[PDB]
Amino acid sequence: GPRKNRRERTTYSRQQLEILETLFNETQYPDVFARERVADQIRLQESRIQVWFKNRRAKYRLQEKQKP
């Protein structure tokens, strides 16, 4: 689900998944301009959102076999 550790924007929101679905999709340029950007989307720190950037970005390995 939308969480890498335990914390999140709320009980369950797409924002947590936006950091990636938006960034990871926008481009493969993992730089301050990226994290600092999505940070305004989910309303989180620029350097903090980085930790969540792996939320979905990492799930890519799980869904690789999960989905049909």
Side-chain angles (χ1 to χ4, degrees):
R3 44 166 84 163
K4 194 230 102 196
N5 27 51
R6 45 238 208 160
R7 286 263 278 186
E8 40 182 347
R9 205 267 193 179
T10 195
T11 57
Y12 43 95
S13 240
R14 54 252 269 280
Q15 290 90 66
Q16 293 110 79
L17 294 140
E18 286 268 78
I19 308 114
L20 337 312
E21 220 302 295
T22 309
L23 193 162
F24 174 50
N25 192 58
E26 179 43 43
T27 15
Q28 213 152 66
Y29 308 137
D31 277 280
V32 278
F33 235 59
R35 54 187 116 160
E36 184 161 343
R37 180 216 192 71
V38 283
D40 202 275
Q41 292 274 95
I42 78 173
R43 215 299 289 167
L44 192 57
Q45 249 303 299
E46 56 215 63
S47 194
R48 184 76 62 79
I49 215 175
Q50 234 181 334
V51 314
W52 265 280
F53 178 53
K54 222 223 183 226
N55 165 226
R56 209 239 62 83
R57 174 62 181 280
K59 252 64 217 289
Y60 89 113
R61 72 210 303 192
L62 210 299
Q63 62 155 41
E64 202 284 299
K65 50 270 215 306
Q66 230 206 357
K67 316 187 299 91

